């Protein structure tokens, strides 16, 4: 199949101690531009960094003094990491990502609900939940009898589910008058045409 | 540093005593997969991504070997300065809209450091699914814990979090 490639963490020459390594690939306009950054963290103290915008291992603390100076000497290490912008970043983006994350499209599930039990001519609230969609770009708008109602509309922030799906709730302050038609509008890049779910008074 | 998409490839976390490690792959906040370090097999978050891509689980075991090595060297280079604990915090919410009859409950713990957390007032575990530690900009971690449940008025649920930064455990009711 396609190959996910990981960077080559360069090596160094009751208490608890934690070490961490990173390999961040910042893509803009596709592969039109890429910025590669590697980070070495010891006890939440980032001490050594390589930034493709620099082109040389730099010391982030006094602890980075040796490791930065050392990794810059041996070119078998520097030229390797420097070139990881193509072997790890560009490769992963143009290869495995396109066949997975950059291809995932999940349409949302739209359901309207009354938070308080319906009492005609008494004020109540409508809630248009929008769940299970990827990516994150989504616009939800509320219509009352064919009129964009932006007043009394409060939408939660984007919610990360952690399994490549999101969630958004958009509450609407309203009062049910008989005959009224409340519709929830959902526009998403995974929808050929906007989804419209109605709720009759 | 903004950009359109961000790939957090090659996350290598190790800590001793305990020889605890982790090797994961993230892209836009969500995790592509981790590598099981005791089974030596890549475990994908989405099974669909498994059939579409591949990653040699051996491309990590070695990285963690490098990370175990650098940690031992750095612990001595600082005269053995221990890591500072950090108080975690949790927020519990359901994945799909909770209709009282099908659904799963998610506990989102953040500000975890060091990465050692233990996630009807009774021990329950139907189809629990925990994830590997996600990286934060402040180099602490966050982790999610799904729970498969069916809601009823008589039944309320909680999320227990055991951490060294907490003098005593805490729980968030829902």
């Amino acid at each position, epitope marked *: 199949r396609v*190959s996910y490639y990981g960077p080559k963490t360069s090596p160094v020459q009751e208490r608890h101690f934690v070490y961490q390594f990173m390999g961040e690939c910042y893509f803009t306009n596709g592969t039109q531009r890429i910025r590669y950054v590697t980070r070495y963290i010891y006890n939440r103290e980032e001490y050594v960094r390589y930034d493709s915008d620099v082109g040389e291992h730099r010391a982030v603390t006094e602890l980075g003094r040796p490791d930065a100076e050392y990794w810059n000497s041996q070119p078998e290490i520097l030229e390797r990491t420097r070139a990881e912008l193509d072997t790890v970043c560009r490769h992963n983006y143009e290869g495995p990502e396109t066949h997975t994350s950059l291809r995932r499209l999940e349409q949302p599930n739209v359901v309207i609900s009354l938070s308080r039990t319906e009492a005609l001519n008494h004020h109540n609230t409508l809630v248009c939940s929008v769940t299970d969609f990827y990516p994150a770009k989504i616009k939800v708008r509320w219509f009352r009898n064919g009129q964009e109602e932006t007043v009394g509309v409060s939408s939660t922030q984007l919610i990360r589910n952690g399994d490549w799906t999101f969630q958004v709730l958009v509450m609407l302050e309203m009062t049910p008058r008989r005959g009224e038609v409340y519709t929830c509008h959902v526009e998403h890049p995974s929808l050929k045409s906007p989804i419209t779910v109605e709720w009759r008074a | 540093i903004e950009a359109d998409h961000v790939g957090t490839y090659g996350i290598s976390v190790y800590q001793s005593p305990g020889d605890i490690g982790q090797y994961t792959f993230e892209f836009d906040g969500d995790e592509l997969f981790y590598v099981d370090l005791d089974k030596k097999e890549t475990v994908w978050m989405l099974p669909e991504f498994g059939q579409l891509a591949s990653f040699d689980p*051996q491309g990590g075991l070695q990285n963690i070997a490098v990370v175990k090595h650098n940690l031992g060297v750095l612990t001595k280079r600082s005269n053995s300065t221990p890591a500072t604990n950090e108080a975690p915090q949790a927020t519990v919410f359901p994945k799909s809209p909770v209709l009282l009859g099908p659904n799963t409950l998610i506990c989102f713990v953040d500000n975890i450091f060091p990465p050692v957390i233990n996630i009807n007032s009774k021990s329950v575990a139907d189809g629990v699914y925990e994830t590997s530690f996600f990286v934060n900009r402040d180099y602490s971690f966050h982790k999610l814990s799904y729970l498969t449940f069916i809601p009823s008025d008589d039944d309320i649920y909680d999320c227990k979090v055991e951490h060294w930064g907490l003098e005593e455990p805490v729980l968030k009711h829902w």
Partner: T-cell receptor
Amino acid sequence: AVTQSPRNKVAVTGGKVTLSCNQTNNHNNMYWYRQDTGHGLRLIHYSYGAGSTEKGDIPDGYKASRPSQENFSLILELATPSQTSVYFCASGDFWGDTLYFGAGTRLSVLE
Amino acid sequence: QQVRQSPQSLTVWEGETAILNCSYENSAFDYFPWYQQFPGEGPALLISILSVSDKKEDGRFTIFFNKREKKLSLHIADSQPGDSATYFCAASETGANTGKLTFGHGTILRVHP
């Protein structure tokens, strides 16, 4: 360099045979290969560092042990006549381009 | 995945060129070291080549790489009898950070005096 030990051993089927290997190159990776006619060099076990051993392509019958960064050792718990071959030890740095091999061990498992 | 080397053994007369070939299946291979093993001792690196280049020439030994057909060829010139040995052809996918090398079965060289 890399010095395997012993360089020649004769053993009986069913006994325990423990080949050993030491290195003075400050390497991190060590491997155990067996050479056979018509099958080339085959990987049995390898180790990225002290404490961990990773299986190779033919790990059946052998056990590995990496107690030191300098020492790697095979272990034939239950020897069989199918094991007789010339065994080789190697090592290389992380992301190590080159492989530094041992001199070789001639094993003879007889009934 | 597998790697093949043909012929299984070769015999060349002194002062003339030996040609040892090697072919690989996995298109992701990019590092191609060659290990020379004399009787009685282990193998040692002789000459390597990366998929970027088509040939690295090291005096008497030259490798010719073909990314298209996924084929290789080692050329030993003015071969002396001190070259009679076994020549392995290895290939690793460096991007995969495996550590594994996956050798070929190796050709056997015989230099006629």
